[PDB]
């Protein structure tokens, strides 16, 4: 059940503050299924509030205090009680360590305090992993949650391209993107940047120099790239297979949209204001062909122990997901887009408690 940690050989691909960056892995000789799942854990968009990351949330900066080891759980569960869909892939874990939302590509030097490498770090992975079996691969899903999620959706296509430029077309990339599905929409109350999500991501896009899909930033050019990291706007941009996970209210979602549910009836203003919220993050995703977003107010699902609990329809997270896999070779009783059309939190009974 446990992955072990490699630390990048390519040295100058590195954490926040220049350690090495890195990767869990668990092979499993006899498949030609790989997942590589970015973790998530929100970033920094300037020296300030980095260096208060530092001081408090160091492990999403630095290798220098990760664990030899790191035990597999949910999707990277290698055991099929727990996970159903992929229980036999080659399982990676990426650590988190860039806080870019997995887009920077901007080196430590004597004018940067500190290295952006997220969109480098997954590449570099790629590319140490080929030797490691991923060149006999059929399938890379490309996972990750929350903004691990958004990371998926920035950097899917870029793996499928080295790939195809490196020599192997034969690897089908895919994306899964959990919880990463985010709307720049109004605050339910204002506050000073608990930063609005849009200027959250033009400061941090800026100081981390971050990179974004190609035909997306043909489409907001130059200073616009920020649109890029909302998951409506950049999803139509992409060619590789992505599979969206969403809870439909999500709680990253409400804290930057500084709604705090504590207790207490909640008033007609916020009522509205959340039932809107659900009603724009289901529109987003009517055109998402594979997709499955619960009514429940939640963060993350994928790589929790009892991610099999929750259904939408009837249908489990890991069957929509197996689902997905066998359109990718108008199933009977298989479906791939299951998103709750109820218009509260915890409306759908199998919520997570
Ligand atoms: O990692 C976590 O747990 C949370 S990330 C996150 C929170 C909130 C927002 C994000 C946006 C883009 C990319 C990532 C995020 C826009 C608004
Ligand atoms: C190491 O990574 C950097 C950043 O992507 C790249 O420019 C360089 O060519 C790599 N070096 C080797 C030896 O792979």
Redesign the pocket.
Do not use: F, G, I, K
């Given at each position: 059940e446990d992955l072990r940690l490699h630390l990048l050989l390519?040295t100058?691909?590195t954490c926040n503050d220049g350690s090495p960056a890195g990767y869990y892995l668990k092979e499993s000789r006899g498949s030609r299924r790989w997942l590589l799942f970015l973790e998530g854990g929100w970033y920094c968009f300037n020296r300030e509030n980095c260096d208060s990351r530092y001081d408090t949330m160091r492990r999403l900066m630095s290798s220098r205090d990760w664990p030899r080891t790191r035990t597999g759980t949910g999707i990277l569960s290698s055991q099929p009680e727990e996970n159903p869909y992929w229980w036999n892939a080659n399982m990676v874990f990426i650590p988190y360590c860039s806080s870019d939302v997995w887009s920077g590509?901007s080196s430590k030097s004597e004018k940067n305090e500190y290295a952006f490498?997220g969109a480098?770090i997954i590449?570099?992975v790629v590319?140490e992993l080929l030797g490691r079996g991923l060149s006999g691969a059929k399938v890379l899903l490309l996972a990750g949650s929350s903004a691990g999620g958004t990371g998926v959706l920035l950097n899917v296509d870029r793996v499928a391209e080295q790939l195809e430029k490196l020599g192997y077309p034969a690897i089908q990339v895919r994306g899964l993107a959990d919880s990463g599905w985010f709307l720049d929409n109004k605050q339910y109350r204002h506050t000073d940047c608990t930063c609005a999500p849009t200027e959250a991501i033009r400061r941090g896009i800026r100081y981390w120099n971050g990179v974004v899909p190609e035909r997306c930033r043909r489409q907001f050019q130059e200073g616009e790239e920020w649109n890029c990291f909302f998951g409506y706007k950049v999803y139509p941009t992409l060619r590789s297979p992505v599979f969206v996970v969403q809870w439909l209210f999500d709680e990253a979602q409400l804290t930057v949209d500084n709604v705090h549910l504590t207790g207490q009836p909640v008033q007609e203003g916020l009522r509205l204001y959340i039932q809107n919220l659900g009603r724009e993050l289901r529109h987003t995703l009517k055109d998402v062909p594979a997709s499955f977003a619960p009514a429940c107010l939640s963060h993350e699902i994928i790589i929790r122990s009892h991610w099999t609990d929750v259904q939408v329809k009837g249908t489990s997270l890991p069957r929509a997901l197996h689902c997905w896999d066998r359109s990718l070779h108008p199933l009977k009783g298989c479906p791939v887009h299951l998103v709750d059309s109820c218009p509260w939190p915890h409306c759908n009974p199998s919520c997570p408690t």
């Open positions: 390519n100058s691909v590509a490498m480098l590449q570099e590319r």
